[PDB]
Amino acid sequence: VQLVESGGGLVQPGGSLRLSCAASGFDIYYSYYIGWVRRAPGKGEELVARISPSYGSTSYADSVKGRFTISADISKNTAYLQMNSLRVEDTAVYYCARFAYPWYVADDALDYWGQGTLVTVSS
Amino acid sequence: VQLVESGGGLVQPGGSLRLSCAASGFDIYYSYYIGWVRRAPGKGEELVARISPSYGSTSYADSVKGRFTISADISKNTAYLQMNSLRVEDTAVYYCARFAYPWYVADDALDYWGQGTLVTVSS
Amino acid sequence: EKSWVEEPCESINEPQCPAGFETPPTLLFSLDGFRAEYLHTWGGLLPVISKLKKCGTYTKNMRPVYPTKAFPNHYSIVTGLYPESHGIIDNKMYDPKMNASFSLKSKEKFNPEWYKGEPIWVTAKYQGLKSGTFFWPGSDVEINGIFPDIYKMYNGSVPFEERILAVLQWLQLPKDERPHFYTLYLEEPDSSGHSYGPVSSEVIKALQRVDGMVGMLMDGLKELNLHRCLNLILISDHGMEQGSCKKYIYLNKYLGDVKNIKVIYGPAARLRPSDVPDKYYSFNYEGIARNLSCREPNQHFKPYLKHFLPKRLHFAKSDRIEPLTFYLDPQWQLALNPSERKYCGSGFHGSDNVFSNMQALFVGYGPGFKHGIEADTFENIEVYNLMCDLLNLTPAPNNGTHGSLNHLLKNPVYTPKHPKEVHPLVQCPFTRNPRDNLGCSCNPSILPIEDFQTQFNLTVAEEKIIKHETLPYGRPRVLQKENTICLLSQHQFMSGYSQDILMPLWTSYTVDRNDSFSTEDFSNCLYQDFRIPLSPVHKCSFYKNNTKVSYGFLSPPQLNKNSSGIYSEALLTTNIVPMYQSFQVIWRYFHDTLLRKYAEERNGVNVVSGPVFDFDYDGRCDSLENLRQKRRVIRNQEILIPTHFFIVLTSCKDTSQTPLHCENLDTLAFILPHRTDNSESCVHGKHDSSWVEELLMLHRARITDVEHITGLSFYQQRKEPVSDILKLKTHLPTF
Amino acid sequence: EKSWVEEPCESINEPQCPAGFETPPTLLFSLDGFRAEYLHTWGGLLPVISKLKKCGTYTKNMRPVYPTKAFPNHYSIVTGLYPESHGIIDNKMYDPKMNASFSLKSKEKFNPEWYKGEPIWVTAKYQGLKSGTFFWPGSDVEINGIFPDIYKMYNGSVPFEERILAVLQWLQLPKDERPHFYTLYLEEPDSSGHSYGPVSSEVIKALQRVDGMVGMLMDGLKELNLHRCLNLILISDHGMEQGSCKKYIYLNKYLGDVKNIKVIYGPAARLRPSDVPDKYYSFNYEGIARNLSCREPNQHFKPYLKHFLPKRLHFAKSDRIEPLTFYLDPQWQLALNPSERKYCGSGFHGSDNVFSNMQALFVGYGPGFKHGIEADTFENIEVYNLMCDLLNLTPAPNNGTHGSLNHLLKNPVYTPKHPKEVHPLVQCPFTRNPRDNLGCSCNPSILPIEDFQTQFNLTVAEEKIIKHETLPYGRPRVLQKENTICLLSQHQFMSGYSQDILMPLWTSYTVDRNDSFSTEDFSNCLYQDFRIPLSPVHKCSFYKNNTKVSYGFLSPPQLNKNSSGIYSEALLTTNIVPMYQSFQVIWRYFHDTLLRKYAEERNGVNVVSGPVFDFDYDGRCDSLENLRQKRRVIRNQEILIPTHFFIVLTSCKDTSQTPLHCENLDTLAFILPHRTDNSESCVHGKHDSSWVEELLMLHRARITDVEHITGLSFYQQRKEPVSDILKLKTHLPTF
Ligand SMILES: *[C@@H]1O[C@H](CO)[C@@H](O[C@@H]2O[C@H](CO)[C@@H](O)[C@H](O)[C@H]2NC(C)=O)[C@H](O)[C@H]1NC(C)=O
Ligand SMILES: *[C@@H]1O[C@H](CO)[C@@H](O[C@@H]2O[C@H](CO)[C@@H](O)[C@H](O)[C@H]2NC(C)=O)[C@H](O)[C@H]1NC(C)=O
Ligand SMILES: *[C@@H]1O[C@H](CO)[C@@H](O[C@@H]2O[C@H](CO)[C@@H](O)[C@H](O)[C@H]2NC(C)=O)[C@H](O)[C@H]1NC(C)=O
Ligand SMILES: *[C@@H]1O[C@H](CO)[C@@H](O[C@@H]2O[C@H](CO)[C@@H](O)[C@H](O)[C@H]2NC(C)=O)[C@H](O)[C@H]1NC(C)=O
Ligand SMILES: Nc1ncnc2c1ncn2[C@@H]1O[C@H](COP(=O)(O)O)[C@@H](O)[C@H]1O
Ligand SMILES: Nc1ncnc2c1ncn2[C@@H]1O[C@H](COP(=O)(O)O)[C@@H](O)[C@H]1O
Ligand SMILES: *[C@@H]1O[C@H](CO)[C@@H](O)[C@H](O)[C@H]1NC(C)=O
Ligand SMILES: *[C@@H]1O[C@H](CO)[C@@H](O)[C@H](O)[C@H]1NC(C)=O
Ligand SMILES: *[C@@H]1O[C@H](CO)[C@@H](O)[C@H](O)[C@H]1NC(C)=O
Ligand SMILES: *[C@@H]1O[C@H](CO)[C@@H](O)[C@H](O)[C@H]1NC(C)=O
Ligand SMILES: [Ca+2]
Ligand SMILES: [Ca+2]
Ligand SMILES: [Zn+2]
Ligand SMILES: [Zn+2]
Ligand SMILES: [Zn+2]
Ligand SMILES: [Zn+2]
């Protein structure tokens, strides 16, 4: 089981990116949640967006509300995160995360982590 | 996995019996040993005969030495015990036992027990 | 107190319970997706479930209903009815009258109009009982204006231990409002099966953890001193199969890139028009059905009109089934294009409910169940009645035969009885009539009948010996209210002739091991019978040079028990059924090869056969009023062509005894369709040996299905109790 | 100190060891019966082995040797030779010269005369090293008058922990006599596999417990600070398959109840006369071989003379193999009568070594192995050389190509080099000769050659472009000491003509995607070639109306690269090989359908083919002296009929590039037998489409086998390093 990220790079402020996360070894449809977690220097883990692949409901952070758009393709087992109008502090490393079911209490909140892609914004 | 015994009954002194033990769920050839254990009132467990199905070597009790004959049929997964010139105290209940390998110390000496057949001798 | 699993096995002959439990309560515990192969193989890794199996009733396989999915199977267990009767046919379905769609992730799941039938908690409420339900499909819906006493709206974020503790806390409720019927549901090992496949390590962990949950429940039961009072039913709804990404079928290759249709994918795929409800009925389904008719060699799917499916599936009555359906081979699925589908490399279910990997689990424990027993295979639609006998309730009508599953109970409550005939059989006496000419020219080698009165007048000993030889188990009875039939007796075959429809209804005979089959021609040779008035349908002229209809013989004239030729009396007028040109191939191949093979192998077989008329595709025999309008007209005459043909074979379980003196019975029944062409099997450059046998293989059935579709009752003279007969009739042949 | 498994993965770039370990020691740890599917599926249940795989070299499958049993596989790993070369061919075998039998439970197991070859501890003793061996097959036998330094006679009553502790105590021995090579063997999960089958719970427990033993060994290693010095090789000898009791074959049905023969049962059954050694050679094996030749449709066994088996098995040289053998389908076994056999419902091994369920395990760890890598499939017979490169020893000659497995090592020791030609190629110049008449009358549509000198005289640019087009990888070289060959050049195919045997040795050409195949007749038409003296074998009269021999074309005349007709120069005299009547069916079907299909699918293929002569069934090409006596005589002339025919196909890995400019190579080789009749495939009322393809399927081989059986060397002009070429040549095609 693994998760691979693609679509990273360097863009000027105001640009648009569409990160893609492809998972193998499990099924996106039968997963509790699929989310993106960004880490920047001087800051810890932060949840920016998460989606329920089956219901379609999405949860967003306040700092990125109205700026990000998350979606899921079930027939290809992919999670897409489109971000537009990037800010100077948005440069960070991104991870694709899969949450665990709450059926058993003695289980970690998260299960798997992706390789992570680094994105930078500069003038 | 189970072991079934057959050939029991009531005989006069001096008669001959041929007990048969048929095993299912495992293989006689790949077993450490196959033996017979007899229990009589006022006495505990006693090993009368045991055989190694692959090597063919046999081990016998002193009380039955020269009187019993144990053999194994591999193509049918059977153990045969032929007893002749029975004595008055030979009446007892017999069990077909399979010994365990000494590979792991934290294992019981025996593994499985048969249903057991009751044999009586009387005038 | 030590764990319950460590205690030695014991027996519960009489329940001891606190006040308020004169009738012990029942618990219905469900493990989603747990298939029988799991307990067959990994039993050593599961101590609690193995102990429960050892000290209680158990069955190797339980057969689900088609389609093999969640709501149909979880609502048929409580209703007792087939999915075509209780409404919920699948997890996704469309109703044109409501102009609505049913889905798991939408708000339409709670619409009371989607649910039909009558669940068990409704019956308990009607007959003075209370029930506490925890996450059972359909329980959180106001069915018939009634809710369960205690219920929880579905929510998948609740831990399992909270559910178990809530059930126990309800069990400690005071007797004033203590429920008498509980349920409990878990989502695994289904989710791990989808994510990782039937054979992996995560499934092993899931099995061990659900076993731990069951052990927790049992320990909680023991701590309350209720371990010898409650009735426990450990059940499951379906099995799991491993799907590959190279085993899909895409309709875009054959149907092109058309954009006016929709397909429900999976192993139970269906086709629907996109424009609804205006084009739901006006659409042309037959064009698409013939378009994909075996376009490739050994293609692993088959199109089917919903009224041409095998009668053992019971998937045609409701109007929520699309008029087109696809039958898929094992491990294969179907879709339109790769975009409109789910993932491919994952586990799946929903295939035909007779495959070995689709079987479910059933374990019983408690005072009301026998100890250390093992039963045969039975359907889940019969659990309902069983529960009704564990709570002293009168079941609502359903599709289970009461008393069939009566050998699983220590003290049976209901005693089944044989149904009785409505009216006595009329007699067809001899009457003098002129010798008419039927215009038939046949082989002169056939010996004609000289005197009808002389050969067909027999002393009472002759009728006695003929009845003994040809009807060992007794004549079949008729349960139809208005139907006049007369019993016709011959030398080696007995028939029931119906005056209303002018056709035999059943023909019974016996084939012995030493009996021989002839090979001479017997075409266009008809002998008139004086016991009935003549009919213009009963002449060779009607069937002479006709490309639409033909005739066949229920009793095979190839079989002669005294001579090496052919039997003359089998060529009578009262032994003729209309038949299509193509069906004669199957009929002749059967009667020539398969009957002889079965007689040789099984040391004689008793064979009884006939036609069945069902134009409503509802599974029940048509009434006379309905049957009157459906008759066709040709050559200025009126005929009534059969819809299917039923044949049933009986013999002894042991090959050393003839069927005349069977200690135990072995039975094999078939209901074959009557089609104009053989496009279903796609015969093309293929030897006739295999396809006929395969068609007979696929279209098997039970005796209960034949009884429902004919109105006949079999085996009413056996000395065995009625419960054993009902159990035998419900057995579906397996190969 | 924490457990070794809990430590994070690290890298060992340089070994740090105490004094006396300048060259790190090597440990050979074996788990009997552990198949690769176990690690493929239940890896999550095995932490230590999964961690070892993650932080070291790993391969998905390792191919055992035939037969797939204990001693052959455990002694080929240490010797490096095939079972036909090192003597031990099975657990049970009979030597007539010794007039003795070898068995596991007898005293003959310790007889030094049964063991041949040269193990690895013998080499270590010769080159100044010490080795401590614990229960390895053949280690407790005085081989060549030499024992290992420390050894234990086999005894199955010793617990595993005692073996591990003894190995550790030997590891703590002082440097004066400290061994440099250790082994260790365990009896599971083989015993549980036999008793309970490959898929059960006891096998899961056995896997977990052997994993625990491995973890114990690793913890003991870490506690001694040797966890970054030792080289660990986790290996296995075979796999397991589940045998059913309804899948046996009994010879008493066909051969009757005869009592003068003996059969060695199992999936590698063999037949022997009972009277030995007097009747060992005088017996009539061919009668029994033809007796059981496909007596039933699709029977799941095939008789084989030991010199007619596929050449990829290498099971014919030794005299301990009975001259008759049976090839069994998967999951099937063979026996004589139910009395002379073992149990039926249990696991088994010993089938063909290419089946998916017979593959073994290989894991490497330590300073000398790369980290986090995954290699392709390789045979176990090449581990020997690898070990020789991990201890700085000079290997004895064996059947492994040194340097093929060189990409598994951080610092390679041996650098392979291409073999060099013995003598330069002689030239066959043109010589004036009279125009003789060959007496051939063919289709006039074929355009005859007018002037031989004019069309076959070309400017240097023409030879350059022809060499570029037809020989992209360079001409094959010849390694035979005494063999005079001349290179013949044509427009689109290049040949090597041998003067000694009067026959072409190899023909090379290329087939493009757009090339077309003709369908005209070209029989009995031969054109004389002036570059060589005429021969009476080179006339149509010899092959005119002959029922014994015939002729075939190495370069297919059906292929024309410029016109739609047929190629005239392909009908030359120097392009003829003797052929039997029956083989022409396979040859023509291949050249007509399969070549075109491969060219279409793979975008052009480079094809080079020829005959091979091997009358000793030893796997190596015959010498001229031996070949001289084996030539047959017919029609007062002397001919030399080929024994097999080899064909090899090359293309690019990616379909977007033509073979002329392949970045990476994809290769497919076949060695097909030359038989008088097609009784091997049992063609009878069967379409020709399938059996030829199946025969080509079964008789595949590697490039190394072709090189050994021909004396030729291929791919000597590629720019890739020699190690990559050796790795590619050792790859055996899989489907
Ligand atoms: C499904 O159940 C979960 C857990 O029981 C609910 O989530 C809880 O919501 C309450 C709101 O009162 C919070 O106080 C808890 O902290 C939540 N628990 C967790 C684990 O997040 C959830 O609201 C329920 N869903 C519905 C639709 O009722
Ligand atoms: C299964 O049982 C149901 C209920 O007894 C049968 O459906 C009934 O059919 C009759 C006649 O068509 C109707 O009058 C009833 O209203 C139906 N009841 C319900 C609840 O729908 C159904 O026919 C049975 N199926 C079979 C195959 O016998
Ligand atoms: C195989 O090993 C076993 C155990 O190591 C040997 O059995 C032991 O024999 C000694 C004799 O000196 C006894 O003192 C022990 O009590 C025995 N151990 C057990 C567990 O029985 C056995 O003798 C060895 N076999 C051979 C042929 O050497
Ligand atoms: C495998 O290697 C062995 C050893 O190099 C080869 O056997 C040798 O064959 C030659 C010629 O027949 C003999 O002179 C040697 O004595 C043999 N050596 C041994 C140790 O037996 C064998 O031919 C090789 N096999 C293949 C298929 O190449
Ligand atoms: N009322 C309900 N009861 C049980 N499961 C439900 C319900 N509603 C939705 N589901 C979901 O539907 C799934 C059905 O899975 P399957 O059995 O594979 O069709 C379950 O595993 C649940 O996640
Ligand atoms: N010297 C030996 N080394 C290892 N195993 C041996 C030896 N001698 C006999 N055996 C037995 O032979 C068996 C071979 O099993 P298999 O691999 O199934 O052929 C082993 O499991 C041992 O029980
Ligand atoms: C039926 O449903 C469809 C789809 O929701 C809708 O477009 C239509 O207006 C509805 N009513 C009728 C009469 O079709
Ligand atoms: C099936 O339908 C498609 C599109 O309507 C058509 O192209 C094709 O020919 C049809 N197949 C037949 C007629 O066999
Ligand atoms: C060979 O072995 C057989 C069987 O052990 C024996 O009967 C015979 O005497 C031996 N010697 C010869 C020359 O056959
Ligand atoms: C095979 O041999 C047996 C006995 O020798 C014989 O009865 C049978 O006919 C033979 N099969 C043939 C000749 O096909
Ligand atoms: Ca009807
Ligand atoms: Ca040779
Ligand atoms: Zn389910
Ligand atoms: Zn499911
Ligand atoms: Zn082994
Ligand atoms: Zn083994």
**D338 chain-B contacts, CB cut-off 8 A:** 75
Q: Give the span between the Cα atoms of C377 and C375, in whole angstroms.
A: 7
Residues 6+ positions from C266 with CB-CB distance below 8 Å? C333, C334, C348, C350
Q: Which tokens is D422 given?
A: 């013995």
Helix axes D383-390, D70-79, angle to 10 degrees: 40
Nearest to A101, CA basis, from C191, C236, C185, C237: C191
Residues D160, B104: C-beta atoms closer than 8 Å: yes
- CB under 8 Å to D698, separation ≥6 — which residues? D310
Q: Which of D342, D344, D348 to mutate to test the interface with B (most CBs of B within 10 A)?
A: D342
Residue numbers in A near C158 (CB within 8 A): 102
With beta carbons under 8 A apart, name residues in chain B contacting D187.
Answer: 103
User: Does the beta carbon of C190 lie inside 6 Å of ligand 5?
Assistant: yes
Contacts C44 to D, Cβ<8 Å: 200-202
Interface of D with C in 29-68 (CB under 8 A): 41-45
Q: D686 in contact with C at a CB cutoff of 8 Å?
A: no
3-state helix, strand, coil in chain B (%, to 5): 5, 50, 45
Tell me the two tokens of residue D101. Answer: 């039998």
Cα–Cα nearest to D503, from D578, D423, D582:
D578
**Inter-chain touch D194–B30, beta carbons under 8 Å:** yes
Tell me how far apart the alpha carbons of residues D306 and D107 are, in angstroms, rounded to a whole number: 29
* Strand positions, DSSP E, D531-592: 551-552, 559-560, 577-578
Nearest by Cα to D670 from D700, D697, D691, D694: D700
Residue in chain C lying closest to A104 (CA): C159
User: Long-range contacts for D101-107 (Cβ within 8 Å, ≥24 apart)?
Assistant: D105/B54, D105/B55, D105/B56
Q: How far is D599 from chain C (nearest CA, A)?
A: 25
Per-residue tokens: A73? 């393709």
Nearest protein CA to atom 9 of ligand 5, as residue: C104
Instruction: Say if CB C132 and CB C148 are below 8 A apart.
Output: yes
* Residue whose entry in the numeric block shows the structure tokens 């025999």: C621
| C576 CA to centre of own chain | 29
Helices (H) and strands (E) in chain B, counts: 0, 11
C279-290 burial: b if 16+ Cβ within 10 Å, else e: ebeebebeebbe
Method: cryo-EM
How many other CB atoms are found less than 10 A from the CB of residue C663? Answer: 9
What is the residue type of D252? Answer: N
Cα separation, D694 vs C20, in Å, equals: 75
Tokens at C536, concatenated:
């213009």
With beta carbons under 8 A apart, name residues in chain A contacting C159: 102-105
Amino acid letter at D544? K
Chains C and D make contact, 3+ CB pairs within 8 Å: yes
C563 CB within 6 A, ligand 7: no
Look at residues C526, C529, C535, C503 and name the one whose alpha carbon lies nearest to residue C431: C529
Angle (deg, nearest 10), helices D201-223 and D160-171: 20
Domain locations along chain B: 2-121
Contact D41 C201 (CB under 8 A): yes
Question: DSSP class of residue C623?
Answer: P
Q: Do C202 and D41 touch (CB under 8 A)?
A: no
Angle between helical axes of D201-223 and D47-54 (0-180°, round to 10): 60
Instruction: Count the helices and strands in chain C (H runs, E runs).
Output: 20, 31
Chain C stretch 695-724, residues whose beta carbon is closer than 8 A to a beta carbon of chain D = none
Cα D518 off chain centre by = 36
- Torsion, Cα D383 D385 D389 D394, to 10 degrees, reads 150
Q: How far is A86 from chain C (nearest CA, A)?
A: 31
Q: Whose CA is nearest to atom 6 of ligand 9?
A: D99
Cβ(A13)–Cβ(A88) below 8 Å: yes
Strands (E), chain A: 2-6, 10-11, 16-24, 33-39, 46-51, 58-60, 68-73, 78-84, 92-99, 110-113, 117-121
Contacts of D440 (CB under 8 A, 6+ apart): D524, D525, D526, D539, D540
CA distance D129 to D131: 7
Q: At the topology level of CATH, where does A2-121 sit?
A: Immunoglobulin-like (2.60.40)
- Which residue in C161, C191, C342 is closest to A74 by CB distance? C342
Inter-chain contacts counted by CB atoms under 8 A, chains C and D: 21
| Contact between C360 and C239 (Cβ < 8 Å) | yes
On whether the CB atoms of residues D692 and D586 are closer than 8 A, the answer is yes
Find the ligand nearest to C280 CA: 7
Q: How far apart (Å, rounded) are the C-alpha atoms in residues C113 and C99?
A: 12
CB atoms within 10 A of CB A48: 22
The answer to whether residues C424 and C485 touch, using CB atoms and an 8 Å cutoff, is no
For ligand 3, is residue D156 a contact (CB within 6 Å)?
no
Q: DSSP label at C675?
A: -
Q: What is the 3-state secondary structure (H, E, C) of C573-590?
A: CCCCEECCCCHHHHHHHH
* CB atoms D343 and B77 under 8 Å: yes
Task: Say how far apart CA C701 and CA C690 lie, in whole Å.
Answer: 20
Which residues share a beta bridge with C418? Answer: none
Q: Which atom of ligand 9 is nearest to the CA of D277?
A: 14
Long-range contacts of C462-471, Cβ-Cβ distance < 8 Å, separation of 24 or more: C463/C489, C466/C490, C466/C491, C466/C492, C466/C494, C467/C494, C468/C660, C469/C510, C469/C660, C470/C494, C470/C508, C470/C509, C470/C510, C471/C508
Q: A120 Cβ partners below 8 Å, 6+ apart?
A: A10, A91
- Report CB contact under 8 Å: C105, A30: no
- Of residues D158, D341, D346, nearest to B27 (C-beta): D346
Helix (H, G, I), strand (E, B) or coil at C529: coil
Contact C187 A29 (CB under 8 A): no
**C622 DSSP 8-state letter:** P
Pairwise CA distance, residues A56 & C93, whole Å: 20
Enumerate residues 6+ apart whose C-beta is below 8 A from C278: none
Cβ-based contacts of C205 with chain A (< 8 Å): none
Which alpha helices (H) appear in D239-316, and where do they start and end?
252-255, 285-291
Tokens 């505990």: give the residue: B44
Strand, helix or coil at D297? coil
Q: Which DSSP symbol is given to D591?
A: I
C106 Cβ partners below 8 Å, 6+ apart?
none
Report the alpha-carbon distance of residue B78 to residue D339 in Å, rounded: 13
- Residue of D381, D399, D450 whose CA lies nearest to D63: D381
**Side chain identity at residue D525, one-letter code:** C
- Kindly give the interhelix angle for D703-710 and D722-729, rounded to the nearest 10 degrees: 90
- From start to end of C172-260, where are the E strands? 181-186, 231-235, 241-242
Question: DSSP per residue over D131-164, as a string?
Answer: EE-SS-TTTTS-BTTB--SB-----TTS-HHHHH
D104 lines ligand 6 (CB under 6 A): yes
Q: Which atom of ligand 2 is nearest to the CA of C314?
A: 27
Q: Does D204 touch chain C (CB under 8 A)?
A: yes
D157 contacts B30? CB cut-off 8 A? no
Give me the resolution in angstroms, 1 decimal.
3.2
Tally of CB atoms within 10 A around C474: 13
Q: Is the CB of D478 under 6 A from ligand 4?
A: no
To the nearest whole angstrom, how far is the Cα of D590 from the nearest Cα of chain C?
A: 24
D45/C200 CB distance under 8 A? no
Question: How far, in Å, CA of D717 to CA of C335, rounded?
Answer: 50
Nearest chain C CA: its distance from A7 CA (Å): 22
How far, in Å, are D445, D510, D515, D610 from residue D561 at the CA level?
18, 10, 6, 22
